[PDB]
Design an enzyme around this catalytic site. Sequence first.
Site, PDB file in Angstrom:
ATOM      1  CB  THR B  13      36.248 -58.858 -12.800  1.00 43.52           C
ATOM      2  OG1 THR B  13      35.475 -59.910 -13.336  1.00 43.52           O
ATOM      3  CG2 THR B  13      35.163 -58.539 -11.361  1.00 43.52           C
ATOM      4  CB  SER B  43      42.845 -55.487  -6.991  1.00 43.02           C
ATOM      5  OG  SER B  43      42.889 -54.951  -5.666  1.00 43.02           O
ATOM      6  CB  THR B  76      36.950 -56.734  -4.508  1.00 47.09           C
ATOM      7  OG1 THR B  76      37.396 -58.094  -4.885  1.00 47.09           O
ATOM      8  CG2 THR B  76      35.711 -56.318  -5.559  1.00 47.09           C
ATOM      9  CG  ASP B  77      41.344 -60.163  -5.034  1.00 51.68           C
ATOM     10  OD1 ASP B  77      40.197 -60.467  -4.444  1.00 51.68           O
ATOM     11  OD2 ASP B  77      41.791 -60.775  -5.999  1.00 51.68           O
TER      12      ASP B  77
HETATM   13  N1  LIG Z   1      41.867 -60.640  -8.507  1.00 48.51           N
HETATM   14  C1  LIG Z   1      40.938 -59.528  -9.181  1.00 48.51           C
HETATM   15  C2  LIG Z   1      39.260 -60.167  -9.078  1.00 48.51           C
HETATM   16  C3  LIG Z   1      38.368 -59.431  -9.461  1.00 48.51           C
HETATM   17  C4  LIG Z   1      38.019 -58.193  -8.897  1.00 48.51           C
HETATM   18  O1  LIG Z   1      37.751 -58.178  -7.568  1.00 48.51           O
HETATM   19  O2  LIG Z   1      37.634 -57.158  -9.529  1.00 48.51           O
HETATM   20  C5  LIG Z   1      40.965 -58.168  -8.807  1.00 48.51           C
HETATM   21  O3  LIG Z   1      40.928 -58.184  -7.284  1.00 48.51           O
HETATM   22  O4  LIG Z   1      41.159 -57.463  -9.521  1.00 48.51           O
END
Ligand SMILES: N[C@@H](CCC(=O)O)C(=O)O
Lengths: 308, 308, 308, 308
Positions: B13, B43, B76-77
């Site tokens: 994000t 992620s 971040t995930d």
């Molecule tokens: N599900 C997204 C959450 C947004 C983020 O952490 O950048 C990801 O991990 O890419």
Amino acid sequence: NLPNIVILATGGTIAGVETLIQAVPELKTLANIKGEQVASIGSENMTSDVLLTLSKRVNELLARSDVDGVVITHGTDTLDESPYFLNLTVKSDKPVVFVAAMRPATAISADGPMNLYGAVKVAADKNSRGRGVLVVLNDRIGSARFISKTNASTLDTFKAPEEGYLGVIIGDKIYYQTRLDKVHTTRSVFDVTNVDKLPAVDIIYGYQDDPEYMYDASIKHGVKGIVYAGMGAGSVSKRGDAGIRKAESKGIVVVRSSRTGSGIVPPDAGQPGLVADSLSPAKSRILLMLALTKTTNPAVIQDYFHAY
Amino acid sequence: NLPNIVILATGGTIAGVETLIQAVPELKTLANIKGEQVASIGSENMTSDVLLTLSKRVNELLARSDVDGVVITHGTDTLDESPYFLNLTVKSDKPVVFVAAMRPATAISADGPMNLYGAVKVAADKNSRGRGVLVVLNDRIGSARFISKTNASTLDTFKAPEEGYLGVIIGDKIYYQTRLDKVHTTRSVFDVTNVDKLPAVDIIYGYQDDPEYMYDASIKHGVKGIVYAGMGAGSVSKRGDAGIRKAESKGIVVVRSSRTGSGIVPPDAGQPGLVADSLSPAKSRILLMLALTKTTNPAVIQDYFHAY
Amino acid sequence: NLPNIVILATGGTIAGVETLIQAVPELKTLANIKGEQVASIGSENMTSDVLLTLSKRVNELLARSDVDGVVITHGTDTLDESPYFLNLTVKSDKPVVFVAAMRPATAISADGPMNLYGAVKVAADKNSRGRGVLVVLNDRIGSARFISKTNASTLDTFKAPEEGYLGVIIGDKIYYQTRLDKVHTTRSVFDVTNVDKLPAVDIIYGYQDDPEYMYDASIKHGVKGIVYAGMGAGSVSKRGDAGIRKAESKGIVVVRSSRTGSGIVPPDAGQPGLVADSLSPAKSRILLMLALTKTTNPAVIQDYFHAY
Amino acid sequence: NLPNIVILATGGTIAGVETLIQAVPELKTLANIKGEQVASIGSENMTSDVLLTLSKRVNELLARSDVDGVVITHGTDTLDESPYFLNLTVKSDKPVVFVAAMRPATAISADGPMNLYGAVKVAADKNSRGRGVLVVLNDRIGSARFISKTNASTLDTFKAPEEGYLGVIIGDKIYYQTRLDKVHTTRSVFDVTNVDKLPAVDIIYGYQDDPEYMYDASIKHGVKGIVYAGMGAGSVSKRGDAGIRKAESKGIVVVRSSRTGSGIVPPDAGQPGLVADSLSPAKSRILLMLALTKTTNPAVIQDYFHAY
Ligand SMILES: N[C@@H](CCC(=O)O)C(=O)O
Ligand SMILES: N[C@@H](CCC(=O)O)C(=O)O
Ligand SMILES: N[C@@H](CCC(=O)O)C(=O)O
Ligand SMILES: N[C@@H](CCC(=O)O)C(=O)O
């Protein structure tokens, strides 16, 4: 006259349970102690069946007038589940205090003795009533709804970074700080006094390259619920998404928890399954099992997660 | 002049890679920036095949004299896995800095802009060399070996309670406090330069009433390794014990990690499988996958776990 | 039919008060906003005189039917004091929410905008009522009784290790988890409505080779109380012991706090002065200062420290 | 043959020094132990003159071929100062390990015995060399530069939120994870071998309504330095700004630290005095005191603060 405390033993390194009174003679000044062996297994082997037996016995003992508080010796490995189960299934305001040890009783500077002293002291205190199920280790008094084992092998392992402790035990005195702002004990709608067998609930981990076949194995064995220990805020991968929707098409209720260790998993209409609020995968499983004995309506189960 | 930094986008994000350099004009005072789009996914969907592409591209860039450091925008995930993968596969001392954002770029007080500034500043600093792969968010500089997402939704989620941070970024200045005392980057023996597919490894969770059929699912699909996110210090139940020994008889290397969140899983001859040391289930999986490219011997793999 | 919230500005980098309101247009969906300038100073220059003016102004507004809550923009440097002062002087259930920012409004990824959104979001929520004075920064809702700046320069600085937060603000929704188990606001006995000048209280630090002449300086200037930020659990040295006893012989009420950052300072008959319970040196000063407006009785003041 | 460890006793509730060696027979498997009584006082009474004696004794012992490491029993109240002092004055790479206990030896589950065992184990391990002065409590190995007593009365009180621990002790095994990235011991330019008396340094606390007369007291008594435990990032009030400038006009070196408990105090050309980097008020005083034996040059001293 001193209070009446009943010590229910379930096993663990904290211990027979009759040798403890002789090893810790300081308990005599706290209350009238009566021991009782419920089980003799390690917490890693603690099952849903033994929790039913334990809960029914607790509600039976707390119904008596010659019982003021109950101290339950348990293992540390699954102390994330057990206390929280009792937190939702006990119908009394009397103190139910879980205690454990991170070091064996025969070890140097064993924490068992002091933890036991603190647990009984909390159960014998009238001010500790109506605060929900409590967990006492390392001079801390944690809430069953928030406390969890955060470290694999340390004495201070039981923490709740985002919620802290309800109170502490310093200088042979109890200091209460906060109260649990969730539905617990006497105000709970969960009654398992008649329940003989609890619905099967699995926990699947979220990670890079996570296989869909784990969800298939849960479906094959017709489990009633699945808790998803997801990446970040319960985020699902393309394979995890497909596995969850496949389970939901079979009537299985899926709850998205988190592998992070704390925090809020927020509602998301773009993703399948319900959300686990701030509940960990282990605790989310407990609430799910109990919620499945009451209803199957997603909206109602979702209410329990935001309230219990 | 200024150092040359290459920003490698993989998704998240925090992001297009071309828009990133426009929103933060303060980057121009830090370094000469070029961008590439290695991937464009969330992620949660980051896979082993993409990590191979990323690692190979990073090594090609760092071998060039016109590239001083690289910044990798990532979600971040699964920021628990990716940085540690490269911490084992990168062949240069030049800074590799993973950066992410907990809030969308359009949100109020989005953390992306400052995180990227901090990451670029760290990558462009000569004193950041020979420290292993770094992770930068919320003014903190963490090691890929210890840093994990500890909270599901907060800005300060990336922590390492037992190891802290390698350094911090305050008042437009970098402050290094500790160094990683493990093997990494230029001293690592893991090389994926000529690898197209890595050995498959699953993660099975430890909890009360944990199904043995989860291990059966891993075996049927012929995974080369299994990481057990055990109860407490990697403790196995009766069903978990049987599932692990069954996997070991099929040649599957099993490593016992912990669901707690931190701490050491110590050696134990009374339990099957290897021990993950202080490595989390997510990082244990990554190390195991790479370990299985060099050997299948339990002793050599155990040594990797106590050293990497 | 939106709630009516008034914003009282005191100072800090988060701030006139008019420029901020329109900088965050998302506030319009929360409540009807009106701004008032109580003061315009950095929190490092915040005085007890200004706190009197602030507390009285708040009480006037909370008495009005057209006001549902108050948001107070303040600096972070003395956010340990201010909120706790109003936690004892405000006589209403209506939400009083303190808010600040660690980064200047002009900085990259400034926290002010979101922090203000959360503060107003909390002050306008009827479920926030009767929880004591609140402090909102970094998606957290902390109690004025426990929250403090634990780090000199980070966004996540406001923490309470032993007590956690009262709640968190995630995904535009409030999640309350705990309640303050101390006497506050409506149940408070402290009323400074007719108080023109508060008693002077000094804070003396404890450390190796600590001089006694600091206590002589407090005595010479006629302070009414002294808070000792002692070593460990308020332990006094030979020089500190002498200084405290000399102050007590002159009518000065001394309370032993701790320089550690958290924990209980237990009663001790072998050492002089009262004990601060779990209150920090900064918060102990605020309480002692208000306790001196009512009584000079050592027994009554000591009990204030265990209940407030 | 087993290593040769000398245990130096200065006081504390952990302890006759020969009484402890007999209390823990498990120490015989670690090394050959000798005991010496350097001092016998509560750490709250530890002074710089005793630190001179201790440091000089440690240096002459480590210079001997028959001494492999030194364990120093000490109180917890000023364990923030002492270890850091030796971290700057010890001229050897051999392990100097401070140990302490939060509970008296006679208490139930006394931590003393295990801490001492851990301390000796660390001092006897050759891999402990070149890591600076260490502090061992609650199975943790902390750096003298970062570790401090963060809680008044808990067993796990010694923490370093931002830096963590250098290593841990689990299952009778030492796990080193990070190394101090600061100048220490062997590379330190501070030598007190020929120092009979150290310069006097005071610590003045920062808070609302802080008196300027505290600075006048220090000036009157001719101190050579003043550490300011400031609000937030060493922020001064009108009175604090005037007191510091007044002290500087008298040739007194002032360092702005923080009362927060952690974090970086950044440089600021708008405020008086030098800055403490990430050093706490307690540790800042120790460094300033030692720096004053070499120079009064503000630039050189400031450089010590960013390097040590
Ligand atoms: N599900 C997204 C959450 C947004 C983020 O952490 O950048 C990801 O991990 O890419
Ligand atoms: N596996 C044991 C560990 C011992 C303990 O921590 O109690 C149990 O959980 O019962
Ligand atoms: N000294 C300023 C710092 C800026 C801020 O944190 O608001 C204050 O406390 O007002
Ligand atoms: N005042 C004692 C406390 C007991 C202890 O920590 O050893 C000391 O610091 O020595």
